[PDB]
């Protein structure tokens, strides 16, 4: 009986002989359809259940970042040098710098057909730069992390002079512009690459 | 359909071809080590 | 974006199976 | 639903059933007409309950190795109809 | 000092019997500052309102009580006796703009700087001075993910159930033909027997034979192959409504009865919405759903109340990362920032706007987000 | 003379609806940006401060240094420290067979 | 399960959604494409400056 049961719930069964059962048995075989059904049921689940992990570090204080050890496959990351993003870590991540001394970069483009070869795990730049960069790269293969886990997020502005009478109409033109919406219109066509990936 | 399943179709008669052949000669001379 | 089922051309597939069933039966009934 | 052309696979799987009949008359030194076209048309698809083949000794056993073609041969057909509505 | 009642920023909390509040410690075991906060008893209007202590902390708390420290500041927080930010207003003689709520609390010379979540505006701006923002961020939308589950109840076919009558009978015909062509070469039920174990493997069992189980079996993998077939078609389907793509989601554009979604108030999103007059029906029916506080409208929400609500997607994610059943939808839409709300004659513009700047650049924003903010996701 | 067009000329543009004046655009053939050395500032941080620049709007970044030297309004376009990580493609990580 | 997933995927590349196509926006050249002359299509893509 156990046999059998186990047999006829899949139909991948070399070793099946039922020649005992008369006329009982015959009817006990219609099990089979209810067998057959859920397999069928299974195979379609386990098939369409496969159809898809973007981004982890989700800032720059994870232990990812600061303990290369953990894994096997060593962390690349990849800044600039001499400009501002030394001196944004040194101030805040001493013992990081020792290992980022390791990777450096004379170029952006260095930077971006290392990361198209995937000789780099990471890169580390200027947020509007790299979202450029990332929207205007051939394959949608190169994204930034979300949306509010910059470390040190700022802004550009237009640069005044000190106790000059422009100030007061220049912030309220900004605002104004910014509120009615006249920047999505210089979004769509000036800085967009792609925007959809999946 | 196209190259996929004719493919794999010639692949498989080919490679069922060679093994009846092999068996068959293997199974000869495995009778007459038997029965040598 | 369609799921459907078991259509006419289904119908029309098995019509066509039993129709050369029978003709085979009837062929080897004549023999 | 499979088979666009459809004029080569059909003419495919007679011709490999005609040779494996032909191979398994080849093989006599258990009837030839009467066994060989039932088993390879039970060994097609694993749906069939009259399936019987004790009288090959060691010569059938590697011929039921066609049994993995015949059963990806059916999950391609099956994955390819359910992926084609 | 003024501030408003925003969870993931401010925790307002009773105090105890003793006049103070308990003291705790955060995962690093760092301790917990609190500041005793003056406001109203009770949050909803018509209530014997009583302007008894509390005792509310945060995410300001912090830069509030460094700035203190930093620029000689005794600060004396309280709390907003409307619970409303406070724009433009119309009362008896329409013919005056007045403030009210935080704005007009401002403008009363009762107030003097203000540290609280506030939206950069125009209108605010022409009135009140800002300084540089905490951070920069828009707002999303909110909706309810539940777990999905199979909505295939069609466990026969899914229409025309005579498919079945038909197999069968189909079984029937080519046993009987079978008993014809064996008599006309076993007895009684032998070839049903073998006709249903062929469909159903259990191992039951002169030329027209053959060629009857040559058709039956190439018949036999035609019923498994639709049914294997239907049931791929059927679970490749999403069975939940596809998420709100942002604001320009086609369902959104067209207000219904079955989605229901609206602001709070006249806040700064009802100010966003309303300068962009292009969706006039937008406002026929956000407006008729309006509540009084975000804590109310999450509550709603979370009750099955109001498909969607629309607030600042820094409130929203926190929410989401806090208690895994509300999910964010969109990427981001009108970006804006926070501000600090200063009068224009206040000597204290560049002071603070200095500080601002260097507590950012030293690390110590990214440290009150991992605090605060920033919590384990689901 | 050069002809000029980019995001920023463009939002100038959009501001001369309210300014209403005439806008004449430098270059500064020292650096870039410059920073404080031997006390001395250059590039549009150098021109500045030499009150050889009234307005000047060429996307600076914003740092702990200009803010005392200048003032700047309000920012209309976000930066930072950004992390940028290549895609990885999708799998059945998830145990097959099981309840997923 | 294997076989289901690389069957359903659309083996040809997809077609042209419009103007504000991602891949047109971006020109390369693998994908070349262009107009024929001076005429009213090239007055239409020339008016429209970003
Ligand atoms: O506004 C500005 O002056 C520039 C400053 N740049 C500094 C780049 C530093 P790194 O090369 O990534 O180490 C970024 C873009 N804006
Ligand atoms: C940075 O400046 C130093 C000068 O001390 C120079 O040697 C180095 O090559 C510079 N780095 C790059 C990437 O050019
Ligand atoms: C103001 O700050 C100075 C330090 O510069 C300190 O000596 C003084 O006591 C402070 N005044 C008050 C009232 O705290
Ligand atoms: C703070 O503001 C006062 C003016 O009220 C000013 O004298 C002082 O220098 C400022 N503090 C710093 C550190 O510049």
Same mark, same amino acid.
């Not at chain 5, 059943?325 to 513009?349: A, Y």
């Given at each position: 009986?156990?046999?059998?049961?186990?047999?006829?719930?899949?139909?991948?069964?070399?070793?099946? @002989?039922?020649?005992?059962?008369?006329?009982?048995?015959?009817?006990?075989?219609?099990?089979?359809?209810?067998?057959?059904?859920?397999?069928?049921?299974?195979?379609?689940?386990?098939?369409?259940?496969?159809?898809?992990?973007?981004?982890?570090?989700?800032?720059?204080?994870?232990?990812?970042?600061?303990?290369?050890?953990?894994?096997?496959?060593?962390?690349?990351?990849?800044?600039?040098?001499?400009?501002?993003?030394?001196?944004?870590?040194?101030?805040?991540?001493?013992?990081?710098?020792?290992?980022?001394?390791?990777?450096?970069?004379?170029?952006?483009?260095?930077?971006?057909?290392?990361?198209?070869?995937?000789?780099?795990?990471?890169?580390?730049?200027?947020?509007?730069?790299?979202?450029?960069?990332?929207?205007?790269?051939?394959?949608?293969?190169?994204?930034?992390?979300?949306?509010?886990?910059?470390?040190?997020?700022?802004?550009?502005?237009?640069?005044? @002079?000190?106790?000059?009478?422009?100030?007061?109409?220049?912030?309220?033109?900004?605002? @104004?512009?910014?509120?009615?919406?006249?920047?999505?219109?210089?979004?769509?066509?000036?800085?967009?690459?792609?925007?959809?990936?999946? | 359909?196209?190259?996929?399943?004719?493919?794999?179709?010639?692949?498989?008669?080919?490679?069922?071809?060679?093994? *009846?052949?092999?068996?068959? *000669?293997? *199974?000869?001379?495995?009778?007459?080590?038997?029965?040598? | 974006?369609?799921?459907?089922?078991?259509?006419?051309?289904?119908?029309?597939?098995?019509?066509?199976?039993?129709?050369?069933?029978?003709?085979?039966?009837?062929?080897?009934?004549?023999? | 639903?499979?088979?666009?052309?459809?004029?080569?696979?059909?003419?495919? =799987? =007679?011709? /490999?059933?005609?040779?494996?009949?032909?191979?398994?008359?080849?093989?006599?030194?258990?009837?030839?007409?009467?066994?060989?076209?039932?088993?390879?048309?039970?060994?097609?698809?694993?749906?069939? /309950?009259?399936?019987?083949?004790?009288?090959?000794?060691?010569?059938?056993?590697?011929?039921?190795?066609?049994?993995?073609?015949?059963?990806?041969? =059916?999950?391609?057909?099956?994955?390819? =109809?359910?992926?084609?509505? | 000092?003024?501030?408003?009642?925003?969870?993931?920023?401010?925790?307002?909390?009773?105090?105890?019997?003793?006049?103070?509040?308990?003291?705790?410690?955060?995962?690093?075991?760092?301790?917990?500052?609190?500041?005793?906060?003056?406001?109203?008893?009770? %949050?909803?209007?018509?209530?014997?309102? +009583?302007?008894?202590?509390?005792?509310?902390?945060?995410?300001?708390?912090?830069?509030?009580?460094?700035?203190?420290?930093?620029?000689?500041?005794?600060?004396?927080?309280?709390?907003?006796?409307?619970?409303?930010?406070? %724009?433009?207003?119309?009362?008896?003689?329409?013919?005056?703009? #007045?403030?009210?709520?935080?704005?007009?609390?401002?403008?009363?010379?009762?107030?003097?700087?203000?540290?609280?979540?506030?939206?950069?505006?125009?209108?605010?701006?022409?009135?009140?001075?800002?300084?540089?923002?905490?951070?920069?961020?828009?707002?999303?939308?909110?909706?309810?993910?539940?777990?999905?589950?199979?909505?295939?109840?069609?466990?026969?076919?899914?229409?025309?159930?005579?498919?079945?009558?038909?197999?069968?009978?189909?079984?029937?015909?080519?046993?009987?033909?079978?008993?014809?062509?064996?008599?006309?070469?076993?007895?009684?039920?032998?070839?049903?027997?073998?006709?249903?174990?062929?469909?159903?493997?259990?191992?039951?069992?002169?030329?027209?034979?053959?060629?009857?189980?040559?058709?039956?079996?190439?018949?036999?993998?035609?019923?498994?192959?639709?049914?294997?077939?239907?049931?791929?078609?059927?679970?490749?389907?999403?069975?939940?409504?596809?998420?709100? %793509?942002?604001?320009?989601?086609?369902?959104?554009?067209?207000?219904?009865?079955?989605?229901?979604?609206?602001?709070?108030?006249?806040?700064?999103?009802?100010?966003?919405?309303?300068?962009?007059?292009?969706?006039? %029906?937008?406002?026929? +029916?956000?407006?008729?759903?309006?509540?009084?506080?975000?804590?109310?409208?999450?509550?709603?929400?979370?009750?099955?109340?109001?498909?969607?609500?629309?607030?600042?997607?820094?409130?929203?994610?926190? #929410?989401?990362?806090?208690?895994?059943?509300?999910?964010?939808?969109?990427?981001?839409?009108?970006?804006?920032?926070?501000?600090?709300?200063?009068?224009?004659?206040?000597?204290?513009?560049?002071?603070?706007?200095?500080?601002?700047?260097?507590?950012?650049?030293?690390?110590?924003?990214?440290?009150?987000?991992?605090?605060?903010?920033?919590?384990?996701?689901? | 003379?050069?002809?000029?067009?980019?995001?920023?000329?463009?939002?100038?543009?959009?501001?001369?609806?309210?300014?209403?004046?005439?806008?004449?655009?430098?270059?500064?053939?020292?650096?870039?940006?410059?920073?404080?050395?031997?006390?001395?500032?250059?590039?549009?941080?150098?021109?500045?401060?030499?009150?050889?620049?009234?307005?000047?709007?060429? $996307?600076?970044?914003?740092?702990?240094?200009? $803010?005392?030297?200048?003032?700047? $309004?309000?920012?209309?376009?976000?930066?930072?420290?950004?992390?940028?990580?290549?895609?990885?493609?999708?799998?059945? $990580?998830?145990?097959?067979?099981?309840?997923?």
């Amino acid at each position: 009986a156990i046999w059998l049961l186990w047999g006829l719930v899949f139909n991948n069964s070399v070793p099946v @002989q039922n020649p005992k059962g008369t006329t009982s048995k015959i009817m006990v075989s219609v099990w089979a359809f209810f067998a057959v059904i859920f397999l069928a049921s299974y195979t379609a689940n386990l098939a369409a259940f496969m159809i898809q992990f973007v981004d982890q570090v989700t800032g720059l204080s994870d232990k990812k970042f600061q303990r290369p050890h953990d894994y096997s496959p060593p962390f690349r990351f990849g800044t600039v040098p001499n400009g501002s993003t030394e001196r944004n870590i040194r101030n805040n991540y001493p013992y990081m710098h020792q290992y980022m001394t390791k990777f450096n970069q004379k170029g952006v483009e260095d930077a971006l057909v290392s990361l198209k070869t995937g000789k780099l795990d990471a890169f580390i730049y200027d947020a509007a730069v790299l979202n450029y960069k990332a929207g205007r790269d051939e394959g949608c293969k190169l994204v930034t992390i979300g949306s509010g886990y910059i470390f040190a997020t700022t802004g550009y502005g237009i640069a005044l @002079q000190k106790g000059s009478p422009w100030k007061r109409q220049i912030d309220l033109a900004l605002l @104004q512009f910014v509120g009615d919406g006249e920047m999505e219109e210089l979004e769509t066509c000036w800085l967009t690459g792609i925007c959809h990936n999946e | 359909t196209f190259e996929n399943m004719a493919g794999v179709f010639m692949l498989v008669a080919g490679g069922i071809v060679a093994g *009846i052949f092999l068996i068959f *000669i293997e *199974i000869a001379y495995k009778r007459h080590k038997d029965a040598r | 974006v369609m799921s459907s089922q078991l259509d006419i051309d289904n119908m029309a597939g098995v019509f066509y199976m039993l129709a050369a069933a029978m003709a085979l039966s009837l062929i080897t009934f004549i023999w | 639903f499979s088979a666009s052309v459809w004029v080569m696979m059909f003419v495919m =799987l =007679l011709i /490999v059933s005609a040779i494996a009949v032909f191979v398994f008359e080849y093989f006599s030194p258990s009837f030839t007409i009467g066994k060989a076209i039932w088993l390879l048309w039970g060994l097609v698809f694993n749906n069939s /309950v009259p399936v019987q083949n004790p009288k090959g000794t060691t010569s059938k056993i590697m011929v039921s190795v066609w049994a993995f073609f015949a059963v990806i041969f =059916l999950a391609s057909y099956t994955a390819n =109809l359910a992926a084609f509505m | 000092i003024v501030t408003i009642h925003q969870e993931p920023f401010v925790y307002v909390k009773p105090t105890l019997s003793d006049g103070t509040c308990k003291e705790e410690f955060t995962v690093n075991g760092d301790p917990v500052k609190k500041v005793i906060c003056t406001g109203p008893n009770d %949050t909803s209007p018509g209530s014997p309102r +009583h302007t008894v202590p509390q005792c509310c902390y945060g995410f300001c708390i912090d830069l509030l009580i460094k700035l203190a420290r930093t620029m000689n500041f005794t600060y004396e927080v309280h709390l907003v006796a409307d619970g409303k930010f406070g %724009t433009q207003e119309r009362v008896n003689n329409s013919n005056k703009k #007045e403030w009210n709520g935080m704005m007009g609390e401002l403008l009363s010379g009762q107030a003097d700087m203000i540290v609280a979540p506030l939206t950069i505006n125009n209108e605010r701006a022409q009135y009140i001075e800002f300084s540089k923002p905490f951070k920069y961020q828009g707002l999303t939308i909110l909706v309810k993910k539940e777990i999905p589950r199979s909505t295939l109840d069609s466990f026969m076919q899914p229409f025309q159930s005579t498919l079945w009558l038909l197999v069968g009978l189909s079984v029937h015909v080519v046993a009987v033909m079978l008993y014809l062509l064996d008599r006309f070469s076993l007895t009684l039920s032998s070839a049903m027997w073998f006709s249903w174990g062929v469909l159903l493997n259990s191992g039951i069992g002169s030329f027209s034979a053959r060629i009857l189980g040559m058709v039956w079996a190439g018949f036999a993998m035609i019923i498994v192959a639709s049914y294997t077939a239907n049931l791929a078609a059927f679970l490749v389907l999403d069975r939940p409504e596809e998420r709100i %793509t942002g604001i320009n989601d086609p369902r959104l554009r067209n207000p219904s009865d079955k989605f229901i979604y609206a602001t709070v108030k006249q806040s700064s999103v009802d100010i966003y919405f309303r300068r962009q007059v292009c969706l006039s %029906t937008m406002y026929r +029916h956000m407006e008729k759903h309006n509540y009084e506080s975000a804590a109310e409208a999450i509550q709603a929400v979370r009750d099955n109340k109001l498909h969607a609500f629309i607030w600042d997607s820094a409130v929203l994610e926190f #929410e989401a990362s806090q208690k895994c059943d509300l999910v964010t939808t969109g990427e981001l839409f009108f970006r804006s920032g926070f501000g600090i709300g200063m009068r224009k004659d206040s000597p204290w513009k560049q002071n603070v706007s200095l500080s601002i700047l260097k507590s950012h650049e030293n690390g110590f924003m990214e440290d009150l987000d991992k605090t605060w903010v920033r919590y384990q996701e689901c | 003379k050069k002809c000029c067009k980019g995001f920023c000329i463009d939002i100038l543009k959009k501001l001369s609806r309210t300014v209403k004046f005439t806008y004449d655009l430098y270059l500064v053939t020292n650096g870039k940006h410059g920073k404080k050395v031997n006390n001395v500032w250059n590039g549009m941080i150098g021109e500045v401060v030499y009150q050889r620049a009234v307005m000047a709007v060429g $996307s600076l970044t914003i740092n702990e240094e200009r $803010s005392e030297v200048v003032d700047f $309004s309000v920012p209309f376009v976000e930066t930072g420290i950004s992390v940028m990580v290549s895609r990885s493609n999708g799998t059945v $990580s998830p145990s097959a067979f099981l309840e997923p």
